[PDB]
Design a protein around this motif. Structure first.
Motif, mmCIF file in Angstrom:
data_model
loop_
_atom_site.group_PDB
_atom_site.id
_atom_site.type_symbol
_atom_site.label_atom_id
_atom_site.label_comp_id
_atom_site.label_asym_id
_atom_site.label_seq_id
_atom_site.Cartn_x
_atom_site.Cartn_y
_atom_site.Cartn_z
ATOM 1 N N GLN A 27 78.031 12.018 -2.056
ATOM 2 C CA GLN A 27 79.352 12.163 -1.449
ATOM 3 C C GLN A 27 79.705 10.939 -0.616
ATOM 4 O OE1 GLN A 27 79.900 12.696 2.084
ATOM 5 N NE2 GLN A 27 77.710 12.439 2.511
ATOM 6 N N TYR A 28 78.702 10.289 -0.030
ATOM 7 C CA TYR A 28 78.896 9.044 0.697
ATOM 8 C C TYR A 28 78.489 7.826 -0.123
ATOM 9 C CZ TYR A 28 79.634 6.270 4.902
ATOM 10 O OH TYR A 28 80.115 5.372 5.825
ATOM 11 N N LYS A 59 81.683 2.245 2.328
ATOM 12 C CA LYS A 59 82.800 1.593 2.994
ATOM 13 C C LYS A 59 83.091 0.283 2.277
ATOM 14 C CE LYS A 59 84.472 0.028 7.531
ATOM 15 N NZ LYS A 59 84.599 -1.425 7.237
ATOM 16 N N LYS A 74 90.002 -9.174 5.627
ATOM 17 C CA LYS A 74 91.253 -9.143 6.377
ATOM 18 C C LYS A 74 91.779 -10.546 6.654
ATOM 19 C CE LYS A 74 91.331 -8.623 10.768
ATOM 20 N NZ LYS A 74 91.399 -9.435 12.013
ATOM 21 N N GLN A 75 90.886 -11.517 6.827
ATOM 22 C CA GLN A 75 91.299 -12.876 7.166
ATOM 23 C C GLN A 75 91.963 -13.521 5.954
ATOM 24 O OE1 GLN A 75 87.999 -15.359 8.267
ATOM 25 N NE2 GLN A 75 86.797 -14.890 6.429
ATOM 26 N N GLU A 101 84.170 -1.252 12.377
ATOM 27 C CA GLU A 101 84.851 -2.406 11.808
ATOM 28 C C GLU A 101 85.040 -3.493 12.858
ATOM 29 O OE1 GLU A 101 85.529 -3.125 8.683
ATOM 30 O OE2 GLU A 101 86.141 -5.077 9.480
ATOM 31 N N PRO A 143 95.889 -18.156 16.513
ATOM 32 C CA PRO A 143 95.361 -19.526 16.433
ATOM 33 C C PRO A 143 96.042 -20.511 17.371
ATOM 34 C CG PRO A 143 96.079 -18.642 14.278
ATOM 35 C CD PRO A 143 96.720 -17.829 15.345
ATOM 36 N N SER A 173 94.960 -20.781 8.919
ATOM 37 C CA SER A 173 95.582 -21.420 10.075
ATOM 38 C C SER A 173 94.616 -22.375 10.760
ATOM 39 C CB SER A 173 96.083 -20.366 11.060
ATOM 40 O OG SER A 173 96.728 -20.977 12.162
ATOM 41 N N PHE A 174 93.321 -22.052 10.756
ATOM 42 C CA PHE A 174 92.322 -23.043 11.140
ATOM 43 C C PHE A 174 92.332 -24.211 10.166
ATOM 44 C CE2 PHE A 174 90.298 -18.841 12.255
ATOM 45 C CZ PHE A 174 90.717 -18.864 13.568
ATOM 46 N N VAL A 198 80.720 5.951 9.080
ATOM 47 C CA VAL A 198 81.477 4.766 8.704
ATOM 48 C C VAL A 198 81.075 3.612 9.609
ATOM 49 C CG1 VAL A 198 83.407 5.496 10.163
ATOM 50 C CG2 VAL A 198 83.783 3.846 8.320
ATOM 51 N N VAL A 238 94.941 -16.067 9.358
ATOM 52 C CA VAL A 238 94.420 -16.863 10.461
ATOM 53 C C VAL A 238 93.337 -17.839 9.999
ATOM 54 C CG1 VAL A 238 92.802 -15.022 11.047
ATOM 55 C CG2 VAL A 238 93.409 -16.739 12.769
ATOM 56 N N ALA A 256 76.121 10.344 7.812
ATOM 57 C CA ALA A 256 76.629 9.230 7.023
ATOM 58 C C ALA A 256 77.874 8.689 7.707
ATOM 59 C CB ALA A 256 76.937 9.668 5.592
ATOM 60 N N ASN A 302 68.580 14.564 9.753
ATOM 61 C CA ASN A 302 68.409 15.416 8.580
ATOM 62 C C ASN A 302 69.743 15.627 7.875
ATOM 63 O OD1 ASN A 302 65.811 15.636 9.680
ATOM 64 N ND2 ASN A 302 66.373 17.509 10.775
ATOM 65 N N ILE A 339 70.623 16.816 0.096
ATOM 66 C CA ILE A 339 70.486 15.425 0.516
ATOM 67 C C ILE A 339 70.926 14.483 -0.600
ATOM 68 C CG2 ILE A 339 68.772 13.650 1.019
ATOM 69 C CD1 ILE A 339 69.818 15.449 3.373
ATOM 70 N N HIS A 355 95.468 -26.610 10.588
ATOM 71 C CA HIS A 355 95.163 -27.629 11.580
ATOM 72 C C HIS A 355 94.170 -28.640 11.024
ATOM 73 C CE1 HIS A 355 96.628 -24.315 14.281
ATOM 74 N NE2 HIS A 355 97.289 -25.350 14.769
ATOM 75 N N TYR A 414 74.425 14.635 -0.564
ATOM 76 C CA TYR A 414 74.884 13.936 0.632
ATOM 77 C C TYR A 414 74.906 12.429 0.420
ATOM 78 C CZ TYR A 414 75.608 12.953 5.573
ATOM 79 O OH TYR A 414 76.123 12.530 6.776
ATOM 80 N N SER A 448 93.602 -13.158 15.254
ATOM 81 C CA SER A 448 94.686 -13.788 14.497
ATOM 82 C C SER A 448 95.682 -14.484 15.423
ATOM 83 C CB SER A 448 95.390 -12.768 13.599
ATOM 84 O OG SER A 448 96.166 -11.862 14.363
ATOM 85 N N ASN A 508 95.075 -32.676 11.112
ATOM 86 C CA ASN A 508 94.350 -33.695 11.869
ATOM 87 C C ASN A 508 93.535 -34.625 10.976
ATOM 88 O OD1 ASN A 508 93.799 -30.930 14.007
ATOM 89 N ND2 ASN A 508 95.317 -32.546 14.366
ATOM 90 N N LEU A 517 91.831 -28.371 19.901
ATOM 91 C CA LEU A 517 92.222 -29.740 19.577
ATOM 92 C C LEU A 517 92.304 -30.598 20.833
ATOM 93 C CD1 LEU A 517 92.832 -31.288 17.028
ATOM 94 C CD2 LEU A 517 95.264 -30.973 17.460
ATOM 95 N N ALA A 575 85.707 -6.042 4.192
ATOM 96 C CA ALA A 575 86.820 -6.368 5.079
ATOM 97 C C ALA A 575 87.199 -7.829 4.851
ATOM 98 C CB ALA A 575 86.456 -6.105 6.532
ATOM 99 N N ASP A 600 93.657 -23.109 18.879
ATOM 100 C CA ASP A 600 93.419 -24.266 18.018
ATOM 101 C C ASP A 600 93.893 -25.552 18.681
ATOM 102 O OD1 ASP A 600 92.022 -23.331 15.803
ATOM 103 O OD2 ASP A 600 93.843 -22.636 14.794
ATOM 104 N N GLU A 602 88.730 -10.277 13.080
ATOM 105 C CA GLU A 602 88.673 -11.728 13.180
ATOM 106 C C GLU A 602 88.984 -12.129 14.623
ATOM 107 O OE1 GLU A 602 87.583 -12.922 10.314
ATOM 108 O OE2 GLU A 602 87.240 -14.889 11.224
ATOM 109 N N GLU A 629 71.717 13.399 8.375
ATOM 110 C CA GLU A 629 71.665 11.961 8.139
ATOM 111 C C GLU A 629 72.901 11.237 8.663
ATOM 112 O OE1 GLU A 629 71.176 11.768 3.942
ATOM 113 O OE2 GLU A 629 69.034 12.241 3.983
#
Lengths: 57, 89
Positions: free
Chosen positions: A18-19, A23, A28-29, B63, B71, A35-36, B60, A32, B58, B54, A12, A39, A15, B69, A43, B79, A26, B75, B66, B56
């Protein structure tokens, strides 16, 4: 050490290790989200240019 | 004195094979070995769930993305809807 019949904790504990890199985040944005904002610049400055002109006008 | 020594000796005959040694058990008809160390060794995980918590599992983390992507089609509609709200604002 509270368990004298361990037999699984090292598995354990390994275990968990190993993990240990569970993770990544993220973020990622990056195309976009602004892009908000693009705008938002468009404006707000359109509003601010008008109200600044009109208050004196 | 002897009456304690002999019962101390008695602790080295009847329960000596019980847990002190592994010579099973003479007075009992049912055996002592195929209960705790093989059937009940998984007993703690026979009380909880196996191969899921047990191990457990693990896992991921799922995910999440957004707003697709995309807009331009929202938008400007936001608007346009912002125009609708500010007339009502």
């Amino acid at each position: 050490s509270v368990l004298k019949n361990t037999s699984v904790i090292d598995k354990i504990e390994s275990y968990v290790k190993q993990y240990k890199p569970v993770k990544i985040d993220a973020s990622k944005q990056l195309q976009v989200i602004e892009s908000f904002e693009k705008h938002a610049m468009t404006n707000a400055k359109e509003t601010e240019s008008l109200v600044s002109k009109e208050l004196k006008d | 004195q002897d009456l304690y020594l002999r019962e101390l000796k008695d602790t080295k005959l009847a329960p000596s094979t019980l847990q002190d040694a592994e010579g099973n058990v003479k007075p009992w008809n049912p055996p002592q070995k195929p209960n705790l160390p093989e059937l009940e060794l998984q007993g703690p995980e026979a009380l909880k769930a196996y191969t899921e918590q047990n191990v457990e599992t693990a896992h991921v983390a799922k995910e999440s993305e957004e707003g697709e992507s995309e807009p331009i089609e929202e938008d400007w509609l936001v608007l346009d809807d912002a125009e609708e709200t500010k007339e009502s604002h």
